[PDB]
Amino acid sequence: ATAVVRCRTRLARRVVAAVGPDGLLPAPCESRVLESALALALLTEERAEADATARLTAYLRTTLRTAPPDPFQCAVARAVLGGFDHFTAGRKRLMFRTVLAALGATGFPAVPWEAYDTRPQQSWLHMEMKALKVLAAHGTGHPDVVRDEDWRALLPALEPGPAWECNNLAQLLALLALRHSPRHRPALGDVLKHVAGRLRPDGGMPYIDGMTVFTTAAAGLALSLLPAPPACVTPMADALALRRNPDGGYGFHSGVAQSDVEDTCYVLEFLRRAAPDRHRTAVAEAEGYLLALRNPDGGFPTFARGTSSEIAMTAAAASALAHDPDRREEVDEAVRYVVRHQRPDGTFERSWSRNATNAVFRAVLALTGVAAHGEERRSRARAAERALAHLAATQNGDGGWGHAEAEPSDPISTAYAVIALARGPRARPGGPLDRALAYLVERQHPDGGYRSRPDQAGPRPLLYDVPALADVFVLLALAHAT
Ligand SMILES: CC(C)=CCC/C(C)=C\CC/C(C)=C/COP(=O)(O)OP(=O)(O)O
Ligand SMILES: [Mg+2]
Ligand SMILES: [Mg+2]
């Protein structure tokens, strides 16, 4: 067949081979400068784990020369070795300033202590903010400001074993605060040993344990779009469904009790295609989870109602709930939210991904997948057309797309664009979709896989790197488009 189908086939073989007999696609996260630096500071201040501290130190220096990250993380690493268009901005300015001050690189924000108090949402955001407030209280010489409720938010960080909610950043920040408390120091020795035991072969500390639930769901979805899905989709559906949380949603990795809309939508889309009856109850519990989260403006948040609806989250929930005709009223209200928020140049937003193409792909699938007729058909078709025109206008000479219009191409950003474009008109020779496919064919590695700069962000906008996602998302693009 075509070079595209051959590329698709080699890739599917690789993705199938990487699924384990437990039905999971392992998705470890790479070392990150930020957490390595924090781990370095914590162990150093406690005069602990000299072996780990030297490895951490070599990793940080090696990475600064050869693959240095964003400037915030470099300045964090330098402190230890010695624009944002989003509703979260501000809280992030406070968070990132306090981190650098805690490490002695800048002054503590001269803000009222209530600045650090946040509504209940993401389980670990509360812990992170409380930890930073404690570090600022003690850093500025006002330890008596710390309330007993501030300390109590940090207690999960003193549990043995892997970090609570798989978040090394949250635990490290909490531990850096807790070591200032005599009441809590008896539990510290034991966790410092498990922390030191987390180093990766290259000597660094990853942001999170991994993203196996998200990655297995995306891979299962891609495999289920193939002409003949492999057999392993059933054990993958089983592995996801048995990990569902009591609220019916899904976290990003094994042992994440915090559900989120993005993970739940990928599990939901996947189970609807590969196991709608075998996993009928899991499917219905996931729709219930999404429906209970919906905001009154028609949109959907990431984690918790009452927090800002997001475009991509709202687009993802519209596609995921479209299958059942009984949610037409909620699905349509979601798609209208997407249309209302399209920007003047056809784009949408950056959030959990750092490229523009991610939100476009979500938006376009919601806009074209929910069947529609009449004036609302016209209105959605126009919105979708402007999103695909935006893609055509920012396509790079090699046929791919980067994180930003003037950025070098990468396979993941390109994969998102292809999914969107496969919903447009038929690939004409030398058309944008045709050229993006040619870009993906040419970037296939000899081992059948893809190496791509990462797109996942957390805390936004800091990138972290789960390499298994590159194969998964390119496969999802190739499956959608063929
Ligand atoms: C792709 C993904 C599944 C989308 C949902 C995001 C999340 C549930 C998974 C990404 C990994 C996670 C621990 C980042 C959240 O960081 P954070 O709490 O600090 O985020 P924030 O401060 O920017 O709000
Ligand atoms: Mg945060
Ligand atoms: Mg975090």
Instruction: Return the closest-CA partner of residue 395 out of 384, 385, 382, 409.
Output: 409
* CATH for the stretch 3-28+210-481: 1.50.10.20
Cβ neighbours of residue 366 under 8 Å, at least 6 residues apart? 314, 315, 316, 318, 319, 334, 335, 338
Q: Provide the token pair at 402.
A: 């980067």
The domains of the chain are located at 3-28+210-481, 33-196
Instruction: Tell how far the Cα of 122 is from the centroid of ligand 3, in angstroms.
Output: 9
Ligand number nearest to the C-alpha of 116: 2
Q: How far apart are the first and last CA of the chain?
A: 11
Closest atom of ligand 1 relative to the 128 alpha carbon: 19
What HEC string does the chain produce?
CCHHHHHHHHHHHHHHHHCCCCCCCCCECCECHHHHHHHHHHHHHCCCCHHHHHHHHHHHHHHHHHCCCCHHHHHHHHHHHCCCCCCCCCHHHHHHHHHHHHCCCCCCCCCCHHHHCCCCCCHHHHHHHHHHHHHHHHHCCCHHHCCHHHHHCCHHHHCCCCCHHHEHHHHHHHHHHHCCCCCCHHHHHHHHHHHHCCCCCCCCCECECECHHHHHHHHHHHHHCCCCCCCCHHHHHHHHHCCCCCCCCECCCCCCCCCEHHHHHHHHHHHHHHCCCCCHHHHHHHHHHHHHHCCCCCCECCCCCCCCCEHHHHHHHHHHHHCCHHHHHHHHHHHHHHHHCCCCCCCCCCCCECCHHHHHHHHHHHHHHCCCCCHHHHHHHHHHHHHHHHHHHHCCCCCCCCCCCCCCCCHHHHHHHHHHHCCCCCCCCCCHHHHHHHHHHHCCCCCCCCCCCCCEECCCCCECCCCHHHHHHHHHHHHHHC
- Ligand 1 pocket: which of 169, 245, 460 to mutate (most atoms <8 Å of CB)? 460
Q: Output the CA 168–ligand 3 centroid distance in Å.
A: 8
Task: Indicate which residue's Cα is closest to atom 24 of ligand 1.
Answer: 459
Of the bound ligands, which one is closest to the alpha carbon of residue 173? 3
Is the C-beta atom of 460 inside 6 A of ligand 1? Answer: yes
Contacts of 142 (CB under 8 A, 6+ apart): none
Rounded to the nearest angstrom, the distance between the alpha carbon of 125 and the centre of ligand 2 is 5
Query: Which amino acid would we find at residue 455?
Result: D
Does 352 sit in the ligand 1 pocket, CB within 6 Å? yes
Nearest to residue 98, comparing CAs of 38, 179, 33? Answer: 38
Distance (angstroms) between ligand 1 centre and the Cα of 352 equals 7
Phi, psi dihedrals of residue 260, rounded to the nearest 5°: -145, 160
Determine how many CB atoms are found less than 10 A away from the CB of residue 428: 9
Q: Whose CA is nearest to atom 11 of ligand 1?
A: 458
Cα distance between residue 214 and residue 228, in whole Å: 23
Find the ligand nearest to 466 CA.
1
Distance 119 CA to ligand 2 centre (A): 12
Ligand 1 pocket, residue 208 CB under 6 Å = yes
The vertex-181 CA angle with 175 and 185, nearest 5°, equals: 70
* Centroid of ligand 2 to alpha carbon of 439 (angstroms): 35
Residues with CB under 5 A from ligand 2 (ion): 125, 459
Q: In sequence order, which residues have a C-beta less than 8 Å from that of residue 135 and are 6 or more positions away?
A: 98, 101, 102, 173, 176, 177, 180
User: What number does the ligand 1 atom closest to the CA of 124 have?
Assistant: 18
Return the closest-CA partner of residue 128 out of 92, 171, 185: 171
Q: Is the CB of 220 under 6 A from ligand 1?
A: no
Structure tokens at 166: 């798989």
Output the six-digit token pair for 378. 């016209």
Q: Comparing C-alpha atoms, which of 113, 235, 103 is closest to residue 176?
A: 103
Q: Determine if ligand 1 sits within 6 Å of the CB of residue 458.
A: yes
Instruction: Give the angle 467-276-331 at the CA atoms, nearest 5°.
Output: 80
Q: Which residue has the tokens 């499917």?
A: 283
CA of residue 355 to ligand 2 center, whole Å: 20
Nearest CA to ligand 1 atom 1: 352
- Cα 307 to averaged position of ligand 2 atoms, centre (Å): 14
Location of structure tokens 């930003």: 404
Identity of the residue numbered 366: A
Token pair for 21: 């007999």
Q: How far is the CA of 459 from the centre of ligand 1 (A)?
A: 6
Tokens of 90: 């501000």
Other beta carbons within 10 angstroms of residue 45's beta carbon come to 12
CA-CA distances (angstroms) from residue 149 to 154, 155, 212, 222, 294?
A: 9, 10, 33, 45, 30
- Cβ neighbors of 222 (< 8 A, separation 6 or more) are 15, 472, 473, 475, 476, 479
CA 140 to chain CA centroid, Å, is 34
Q: Is the CB of 91 under 6 A from ligand 1?
A: no
Ligand 1 in reach of 260 Cβ (< 6 A): yes
